[PDB]
Curated annotation (Swiss-Prot), chain A:
It comes from Saccharomyces cerevisiae (strain ATCC 204508 / S288c). The gene is BUD32. Transmembrane segments: none annotated. Keywords: Activator, ATP-binding, Chromosome, Cytoplasm, Hydrolase, Kinase, Nucleotide-binding, Nucleus, Phosphoprotein, Serine/threonine-protein kinase, Telomere, Transcription, Transcription regulation, Transferase, tRNA processing. It holds the Pfam family Kdo. Belongs to the protein kinase superfamily. BUD32 family. ATP binds at residues 19-24. GO terms for molecular function: ATP binding; ATP hydrolysis activity; protein serine kinase activity; protein serine/threonine kinase activity. This is EKC/KEOPS complex subunit BUD32.
From Swiss-Prot, chain B:
GO terms for cellular component: chromosome, telomeric region; cytosol; EKC/KEOPS complex; nucleoplasm; nucleus. Transmembrane segments: none annotated. It comes from the Eukaryota. Component of the EKC/KEOPS complex composed of at least BUD32, CGI121, GON7, KAE1 and PCC1; the whole complex dimerizes. The keyword tRNA processing applies. This is EKC/KEOPS complex subunit CGI121.
Length: 224, 169
């Protein structure tokens, strides 16, 4: 059993709790220090590196890299996200969106959504790429009564200044939101876009131009 | 003084102690089984302990470079593959007023007095409050090559950045 090998690896000392496959766990045990954590087993080396670089970008929210065994393919990441009240599920964007779907005309959803775009704007301004920007790969952390967006599984992620790559990532996202087929899907994407633009429209005349380029490419990609 | 184990490695206990007012650094350094780590470059337990982990993982699953695990942790604590440099920047200096005393190996009593035999200085609790009096941020930023644009809200912010560096060995 693969679980057998994993278990033998971290010993009985570490409680695990399988969570996903094709392989991820939870554990309340910290790998070296005397609440809940994440273990990825498996490519990973990529994800680790990235997470390190991404952390260092001011403003950009991503999981803490806690430990990394590159020789066996283990990474312990911090645990982000909680459970929406009323059984609406784990607090990634999809679930948040389904939850508020019949009542989307609030600050909470729009400002939570602009924030999401702020993260992507950030990511792209620094010539980085997710390359799997699904609505399931954006988990929300509670900050008082606001929500704070973070990005996750940078397994298929890379560093790129190719404007096409930025358009694809946006497209993957806007596509995933359209996947649900909500009436309000169009707005979400507009709002995520606002927050994206907001970010570039900040970095000045440079920003506006580079922004204009990614904007046109994205439109093109949406067109293809 | 703390004895601790790493979850994945219960067979290995490790002892850390922190010292103030050390008057015989050079005496020690010159006449050197412990590792004497310069606490100007350690700021948290999260840092120290992650580097221990990495040490073990390295000896268990990859390769051991240095003579023992004490050395190897000094090596693993650093963000470099060059040994002599890690020893030099993370080991005690001749101007070392504080140090972290470390070793790998059950006798708490004999240790506490093997150490104080070596270190003409004043022992104090190995904990974060104490560690964050003696780390030198600018020095850390030098050694761990950190952008001045990187501006963490607190020590956790700093720590994280070093764990990252220690872990991507």
């Amino acid at each position: 059993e693969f679980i057998d090998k994993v278990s033998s690896y971290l010993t009985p000392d570490v409680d695990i709790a399988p969570i996903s496959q094709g392989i991820v766990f939870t554990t309340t045990t910290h790998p070296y220090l005397p609440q809940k954590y994440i273990i990825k087993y498996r490519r990973t080396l990529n994800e680790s590196r990235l997470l390190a670089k991404l952390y260092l970008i001011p403003g950009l929210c991503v999981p803490q890299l806690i430990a990394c065994d590159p020789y066996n393919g283990f990474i312990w990441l911090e645990f982000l996200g909680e459970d929406l009240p009323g059984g609406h599920g784990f607090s990634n964007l999809k679930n948040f969106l389904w939850m508020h779907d019949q009542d989307p005309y609030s600050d909470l959803v729009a400002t939570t959504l602009r924030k999401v775009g702020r993260q992507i704007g950030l990511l792209h301004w620094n010539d980085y790429c997710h390359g799997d920007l699904t609505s399931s790969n954006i988990v929300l952390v509670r900050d008082g009564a606001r929500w704070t967006p973070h990005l996750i599984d940078f397994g298929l992620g890379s560093v790129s200044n190719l404007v096409e790559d930025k358009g694809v990532d946006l497209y993957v996202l806007e596509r995933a939101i359209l996947s649900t087929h909500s009436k309000h899907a169009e707005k979400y994407n507009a709002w995520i876009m606002e927050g994206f633009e907001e970010v570039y429209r900040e970095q000045g005349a440079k920003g506006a131009k580079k922004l204009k380029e990614v904007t046109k490419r994205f439109e093109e990609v949406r067109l293809r | 003084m703390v004895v601790s184990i790493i979850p994945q490695f219960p067979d290995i206990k490790v002892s850390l102690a922190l010292f103030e007012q050390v008057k015989n650094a050079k005496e020690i350094r010159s006449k050197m089984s412990f590792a004497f780590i310069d606490p100007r470059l350690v700021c948290s337990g999260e840092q120290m302990y992650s580097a221990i982990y990495k040490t073990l993982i390295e000896v268990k699953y990859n390769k051991m470079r240095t003579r023992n695990l004490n050395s190897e942790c000094v090596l693993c604590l650093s963000p470099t593959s060059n040994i002599s440099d890690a020893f030099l920047k993370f080991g005690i200096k001749d101007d070392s007023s504080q140090l972290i005393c470390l070793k790998f190996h059950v006798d708490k009593e004999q240790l506490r007095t093997i150490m104080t035999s070596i270190v003409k200085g004043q022992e104090i609790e190995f904990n974060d409050d104490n560690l964050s009096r003696f780390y030198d941020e600018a020095l850390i930023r030098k050694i761990y090559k950190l952008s001045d644009d990187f501006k963490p809200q607190d020590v956790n912010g700093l720590s994280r950045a070093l764990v990252d560096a220690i872990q991507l060995r």
